[PDB]
Design a protein around this ligand. Structure first.
Ligand SMILES: O=P(O)(O)OC[C@H]1O[C@H](O)[C@H](O)[C@@H](O)[C@@H]1O
Ligand SMILES: O=P(O)(O)OC[C@H]1O[C@H](O)[C@H](O)[C@@H](O)[C@@H]1O
Lengths: 366, 366
């Protein structure tokens, strides 16, 4: 509700991430294990029956659900599908056996999300779980179960702490289910350690702010941007492109890194910088070769990478080294630099960061 | 292998669609019912067991698989998932019970697609079915079952007839399965009638070519484009944006129509025309209201719609009326105008239509 020393609520909300994550973790971690005994006593009975997870959401909330799909399939071994809420509500879907329905929403009032929830009641889902940041909102009220993110009020029109806290809460849910399915307890312990390290990995990332401010200068006069990512980082490229669209009004688009050659490579020139989010060596090798093909048009590659990968900048390949981080929380960590990049580009251009043109905090009407 | 009267192979391949579809239909339609007795005798046993379908593909082939997902869930009631081949092959996925693996590929040699196929062998899929246009290619050779599209050789680097014939073949597969699951035989009959009408609906669409040529003039000097679609037409918006990227080098991006307000609306101006693919009245109402919000920046909406919807152009809303078509084949029909739009924009700009910069017919190497 107040900015304090910050210039914008969105800036304040980015900087509040360490603390918002600490608050979402509070009480759910008990003895190196996840404690979701707030869902009620019957909770475990339901969760244990789940054979499929369906997530519905819109905007930035869809981006978090997409990250979580990688986590649910690889860590808890449970099949997961994520769908844009507006798409789900207008089509005839095939219901999955013992499917749990999860809705993600900062506001809990998004019309298409609520609509998908309700429709789901008539379709045979085992039950519904709402992950939301606003207590007692419609989605919270009509869902069977609810896990609040507890990030505090988010005023900026573009979501920041609500996204990182949603990813934290989904990661807790992945841990709990890996357990109920009786998977190696190592899986839950790695997640819990990663989560315990999270708040200071982010304070660690906030300290590179001046380096991101400097990079923003290179993007401030561009009209296009391409964000690339593979696996759990693909959705982070999605959120990064969305943030550049939202507050800087640059036509930034995200693409799966393996698809660069199937289309977008023909577009790359000096006016369309390419950003890659945490690639491994094998992926970097491929992308370096692709950017070489567009060197005559001035294509440049900007790479956010772990210092430990030992990558070196070249003339059209710029490594932006980042502190090493635990693999499980990497997608949450790499979001921060992309939130700050969009914020600094907006500050240079002087655009309305807290109320970007034509956008709204929650679309509560159809 | 030869152009004849055509200026480019891609033009020739677009015009060949009626005939390529006739050839893919030949022998698979017997008595108002689909005849897939080429898959072998055991075929029906397998297909009958399928409880889930997983599709893998890259580029334009992913766009067709995405259309088919709407069809499989709503018409045959079977759960379907479509994934970019490069993403599937680098992650740990949760295998689904009695999942059938389908790969889509014009060339049958795409490295990431082949890789996903092979990995799938080690993962517990009930079996594999390849939909491909090149007989005896790797994907064909290593798959359990195979349905050839029979569109003939495709030389243009960007796919046209291979896409429309893949959609035809998937629609035949949806019919066959609605039957094996014992669903109303109406479903198969509607599909078969739609398919029988298809070849001349397309010859019908090819006759509007001069109207598309005229529309291309409005796009020829633009640097961005936004393509919108809902449901089975969303993937058609994906292919339309991909074609503008591929041969005209315009930064065209596709978006689910319901997500316009969640981001991209802040970008719209005179340099970013918005195209909507076959909206219904309720969707048009919403989009008209959104474009009104960006009228001061010159946002324009171009709508490809059925003449029968009775929509009327306004100052910033241009209806491009199209002949009425059967609902089931609508996604295939609406692809044609978008292929021709990209082609005419490329002809005006004088870009290398058959060999667009930095692109290749099949990416056979990693
Ligand atoms: O997360 P929800 O409250 O459901 O809202 C979904 C989306 O709505 C609006 O578009 C906001 O500007 C976005 O930040 C948000 O992601
Ligand atoms: O369909 P495939 O042969 O698997 O190829 C997938 C993609 O590869 C290349 O990028 C072609 O230029 C595209 O037209 C095609 O969709």
């Amino acid at each position: 509700g107040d900015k304090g020393i910050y210039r914008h609520y969105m800036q304040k909300e980015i900087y509040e991430q360490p603390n918002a994550i600490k608050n979402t973790l509070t009480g759910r971690i008990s003895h190196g294990q996840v404690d979701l005994s707030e869902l009620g006593p019957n909770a475990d009975e339901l969760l244990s029956k789940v054979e499929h997870i369906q997530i519905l959401a819109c905007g930035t909330s869809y981006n978090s659900g997409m990250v979580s799909r990688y986590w649910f399939e690889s860590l808890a071994g449970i099949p997961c599908d994520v769908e844009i809420a507006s798409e789900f509500r207008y089509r005839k879907s095939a219901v999955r056996r013992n499917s749990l329905m999860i809705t993600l929403s900062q506001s809990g009032e998004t019309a298409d999300t609520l609509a998908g929830l309700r429709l789901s009641k008539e379709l045979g889902y085992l039950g519904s779980l709402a992950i939301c940041n606003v207590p007692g909102s419609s989605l919270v009220r009509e869902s069977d179960l609810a896990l609040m993110t507890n990030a505090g009020t988010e005023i900026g029109v573009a979501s920041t702490k609500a996204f990182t806290t949603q990813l934290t809460v989904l990661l807790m849910l992945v841990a709990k289910l890996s357990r109920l399915k009786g998977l190696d307890a190592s899986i839950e312990h790695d997640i819990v350690h990663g989560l315990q390290a999270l708040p200071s990995r982010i304070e660690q990332m906030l300290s590179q702010d001046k380096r991101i401010e400097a990079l923003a200068e290179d993007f401030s006069d561009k009209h296009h941007a391409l964000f690339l990512g593979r696996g759990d980082q693909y959705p982070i490229a999605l959120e990064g492109a969305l943030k550049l669209k939202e507050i800087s009004y640059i036509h930034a688009e995200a693409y799966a890194a393996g698809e660069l050659k199937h289309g977008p490579l023909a577009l790359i020139d000096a006016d369309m910088p390419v950003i890659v989010v945490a690639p491994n060596n094998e992926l970097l090798e491929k992308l370096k070769s692709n950017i070489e093909e567009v060197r005559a048009r001035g294509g440049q590659l900007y790479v956010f990478a772990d210092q430990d990968a030992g990558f070196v900048s070249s003339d059209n390949m710029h490594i932006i080294e980042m502190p090493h981080v635990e693999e499980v929380i990497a997608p949450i960590f790499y979001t921060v630099p992309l939130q700050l990049l969009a914020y600094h580009v907006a500050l240079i251009k002087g655009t309305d960061v807290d109320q970007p043109r034509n956008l709204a905090k929650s679309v509560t009407v159809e």
